[PDB]
Amino acid sequence: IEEKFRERLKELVVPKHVMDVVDEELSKLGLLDNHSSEFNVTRNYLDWLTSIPWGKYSNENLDLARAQAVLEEDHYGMEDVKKRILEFIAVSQLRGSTQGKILCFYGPPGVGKTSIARSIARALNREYFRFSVGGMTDVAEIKGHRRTYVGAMPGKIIQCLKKTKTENPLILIDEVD
Amino acid sequence: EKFRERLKELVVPKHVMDVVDEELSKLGLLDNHSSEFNVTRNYLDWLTSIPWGKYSNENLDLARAQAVLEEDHYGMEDVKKRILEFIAVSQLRGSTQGKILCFYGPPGVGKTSIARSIARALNREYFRFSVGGMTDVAEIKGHRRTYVGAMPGKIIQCLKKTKTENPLILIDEVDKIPSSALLELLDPEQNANFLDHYLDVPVDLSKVLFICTANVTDTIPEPLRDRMEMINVSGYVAQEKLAIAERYLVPQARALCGLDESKAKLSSDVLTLLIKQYCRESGVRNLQKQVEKVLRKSAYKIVSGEAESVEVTPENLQDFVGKPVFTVERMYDVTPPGVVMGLAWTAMGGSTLFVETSLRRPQDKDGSLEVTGQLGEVMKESARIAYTFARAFLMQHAPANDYLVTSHIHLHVPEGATPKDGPSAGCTIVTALLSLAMGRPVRQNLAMTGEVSLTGKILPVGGIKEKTIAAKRAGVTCIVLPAENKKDFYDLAAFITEGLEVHFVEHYREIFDIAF
Amino acid sequence: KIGRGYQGDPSSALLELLDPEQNANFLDHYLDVPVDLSKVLFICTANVTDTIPEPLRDRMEMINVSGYVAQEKLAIAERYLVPQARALCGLDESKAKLSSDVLTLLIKQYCRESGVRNLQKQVEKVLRKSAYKIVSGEAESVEVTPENLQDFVGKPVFTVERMYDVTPPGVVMGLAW
Ligand SMILES: Nc1ncnc2c1ncn2[C@@H]1O[C@H](COP(=O)(O)OP(=O)(O)O)[C@@H](O)[C@H]1O
Numbered sequence A: 001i002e003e004k005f006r007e008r009l010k011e012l013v014v015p016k017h018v019m020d021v022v023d024e025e026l027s028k029l030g031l032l033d034n035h036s037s038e039f040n041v042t043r044n045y046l047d048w049l050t051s052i053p054w055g056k057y058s059n060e061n062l063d064l065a066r067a068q069a070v071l072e073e074d075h076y077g078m079e080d081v082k083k084r085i086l087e088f089i090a091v092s093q094l095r096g097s098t099q100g101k102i103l104c105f106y107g108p109p110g111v112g113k114t115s116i117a118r119s120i121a122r123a124l125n126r127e128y129f130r131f132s133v134g135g136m137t138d139v140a141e142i143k144g145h146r147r148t149y150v151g152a153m154p155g156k157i158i159q160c161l162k163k164t165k166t167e168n169p170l171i172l173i174d175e176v177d
Numbered sequence B: 001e002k003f004r005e006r007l008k009e010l011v012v013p014k015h016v017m018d019v020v021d022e023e024l025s026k027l028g029l030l031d032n033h034s035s036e037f038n039v040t041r042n043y044l045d046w047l048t049s050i051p052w053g054k055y056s057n058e059n060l061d062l063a064r065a066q067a068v069l070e071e072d073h074y075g076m077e078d079v080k081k082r083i084l085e086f087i088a089v090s091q092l093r094g095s096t097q098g099k100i101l102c103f104y105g106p107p108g109v110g111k112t113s114i115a116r117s118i119a120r121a122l123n124r125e126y127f128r129f130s131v132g133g134m135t136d137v138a139e140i141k142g143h144r145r146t147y148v149g150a151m152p153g154k155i156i157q158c159l160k161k162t163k164t165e166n167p168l169i170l171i172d173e174v175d176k177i178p179s180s181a182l183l184e185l186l187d188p189e190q191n192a193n194f195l196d197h198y199l200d201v202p203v204d205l206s207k208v209l210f211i212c213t214a215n216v217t218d219t220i221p222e223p224l225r226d227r228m229e230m231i232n233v234s235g236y237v238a239q240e241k242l243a244i245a246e247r248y249l250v251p252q253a254r255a256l257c258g259l260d261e262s263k264a265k266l267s268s269d270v271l272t273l274l275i276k277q278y279c280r281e282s283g284v285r286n287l288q289k290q291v292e293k294v295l296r297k298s299a300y301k302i303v304s305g306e307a308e309s310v311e312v313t314p315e316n317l318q319d320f321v322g323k324p325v326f327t328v329e330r331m332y333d334v335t336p337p338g339v340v341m342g343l344a345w346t347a348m349g350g351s352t353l354f355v356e357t358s359l360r361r362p363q364d365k366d367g368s369l370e371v372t373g374q375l376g377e378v379m380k381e382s383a384r385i386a387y388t389f390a391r392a393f394l395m396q397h398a399p400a401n402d403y404l405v406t407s408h409i410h411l412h413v414p415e416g417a418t419p420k421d422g423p424s425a426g427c428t429i430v431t432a433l434l435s436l437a438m439g440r441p442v443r444q445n446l447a448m449t450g451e452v453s454l455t456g457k458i459l460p461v462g463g464i465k466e467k468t469i470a471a472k473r474a475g476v477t478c479i480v481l482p483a484e485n486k487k488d489f490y491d492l493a494a495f496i497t498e499g500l501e502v503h504f505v506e507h508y509r510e511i512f513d514i515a516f
Numbered sequence C: 001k002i003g004r005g006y007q008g009d010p011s012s013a014l015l016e017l018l019d020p021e022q023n024a025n026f027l028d029h030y031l032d033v034p035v036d037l038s039k040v041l042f043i044c045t046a047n048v049t050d051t052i053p054e055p056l057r058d059r060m061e062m063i064n065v066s067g068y069v070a071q072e073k074l075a076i077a078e079r080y081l082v083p084q085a086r087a088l089c090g091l092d093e094s095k096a097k098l099s100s101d102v103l104t105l106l107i108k109q110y111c112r113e114s115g116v117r118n119l120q121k122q123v124e125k126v127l128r129k130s131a132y133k134i135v136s137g138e139a140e141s142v143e144v145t146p147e148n149l150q151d152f153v154g155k156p157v158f159t160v161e162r163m164y165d166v167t168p169p170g171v172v173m174g175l176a177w
């Protein structure tokens, strides 16, 4: 029903283009015939559109002392990673807005890269999603399929957004090599 | 009403009760016997089917757990010990829901029956559903009520069948699997709140115990691997295959075929003939197939009028199973010069191989070695390294002996071993070349295995269990192993290594001394 | 039935028809009364072990039906194939006869596949080639000999093996399977 979709947006900050798309799809749903193929298509589409956290951010811990304690508590050593996270927090504190970076941890297996990533998420109070690019070989697993095709599921960043329900999710891409 | 007393007997949650009475009043606007009537009917039937508060009492008692585990299965002492450790840890922690157990090993070892045994031991309700390339979520979560194909799914069907909120769900063949659905099924953050598609109301899968089985772990996704505790289930030796067949396989199959003991029999001798001839695996799957074949043909016999009571002795066995396969045996009872008995760890299991060498041209210029056998790059490298070490060893030990460095040899290693541990025959190749160069045959009943480096260090190998099993089965009295496999050889059993003079070595020189 | 897409017919719709426990209440969309198919013997055929979805592949019991040896093929050709081909082409046994010798030769040099279809094709070809003569008036009767068989079935597809009444110093006889 259009009610659920209209309501799931009342707690978001939806951009104008997304709102245009949602409105035209809702009119299309109103005009379509129930439990038909096109209706299922438009329903799945509106579901995925209205289950994106459009203006929601989680509130981060910017206290250097507490973050440093949380880091020193879960892992020994790793001074490069810990200094990098502390500088990240200092720069995010010198501004008001939230910051976005792209880091790469490389090293032998079993040295705590994934675990320190989870600990960084805990210290920053962000969410935490991880997907593997370990051997994947189809670009659709990242970019998504059209709506025309039968399977038609959106990527994996869209799925991590829908899951974490926030826009500061600390994605972890394992095995990029 | 039927549905009313249904929900009255069991402890319903409030939101569920609200929704069910809502849909019941929605049917109250009667639309008798239509699509929108039977949809509501099936919805309410599934709802009053699902158990809501009722559960099964558990039993974390180690004594009864041990009794059940030893009764339901033979052997598997280490797997049983791991199960008891899990049970004790889960009694201490009290939750019994932390990490998922996953048994892996060769096919036919009965890692699917351990789940039933565990359900019996924990007094839970068992349920199994397999995941072989399902590629869909509709098996787990189901379909929507709008589709003409409207099914709740595997989980809700399990709940309706067990009538229990805390059953045991085995997941078969994970390594053959769609996976994100399993993640949402196993993660305790969302098991407590599980959403079926055919049932918009959620469900609580927090007290549910999940087990997994697989054939190999490498193909299981690393997300799941991070969430499973792997238990290794190994194959059975012939001595315990016999016990399994006598106590479980033959009674089960005789029940399957509608017979009983007074009409169809299978002696220990014919059973072990089956085990050693018509089956060369590490499980009991092919043995179970052969036993079912025997019993089906015996049933046909006793129906056709003849043979009111049939007996299968090792002489009339070809009437049932056919002609003996895997009959080929030791190729050399006294090996000539240039032939050595190595041990191989093949796919099916251990084997004994006869590495052979022969001069090929009549005897400046250097000699040459050509190698047959379907060898790969690594195995050709191993043959070259062994060749060079044997050359140098001879030119140091017998400096006047000119055989290796001038003659043209032909080496043949039989094609049994896996692509890995192919280099395990290095000491065998070196000894074959030395035995050919000198005029001496190798010690009489002597089998060997182990890797050799360019300077003669004896490097460790795998599959010591299979290799010593095949070595004993081939009638070998003296076995040679690398020195880093002392643990592997001594920690396997005592009824396998009794009359077996074993020699552990580190460099090749002492292999030479104990082989000549 | 390769793949299951929009309400896939291959497996989901058939497993509940081949599952021993499910079918006892078989729900058909029309005639919405779950019926029991308990006393029903299901025989499936295939020509590949794979390309059967595993949820069925484990429900059935694969029975292998391998090809035929030359003497099996000869017995089949004499019991069934030649009489049926005569009944179709309308030729009597006397107007054209196929000895066991010529049938053995045909099998040995023309039909070395696993089934009997190519053999039936060759027998039909011989019989219709002879029928043409009977009708065109020439050769009011026909006899097929291992010498003039090339006139009915063409030149052999396989190569003939040599034969040595006295073996030279180079050759040795051997038995093959
Ligand atoms: N410096 C460290 N301090 C504490 N634990 C560590 C450290 N390094 C590794 N570990 C432990 O090793 C385990 C496995 O590490 P993991 O994160 O799987 O390595 P990888 O980098 O391959 O993902 C983790 O559970 C973690 O607790």
Ligand SMILES: Nc1ncnc2c1ncn2[C@@H]1O[C@H](COP(=O)(O)OP(=O)(O)O)[C@@H](O)[C@H]1O
Binding pocket: B072, B073, B074, B075, B076, B106, B107, B108, B109, B110, B111, B112, B113, B244, B248, B249, B284, B285
């Ligand atoms: N140690 C054992 N004791 C009793 N039965 C066994 C044992 N090992 C295997 N089996 C038999 O093997 C069959 C199950 O094989 P299983 O190991 O489940 O194969 P898979 O692992 O491929 O599912 C069961 O019928 C079970 O009776």
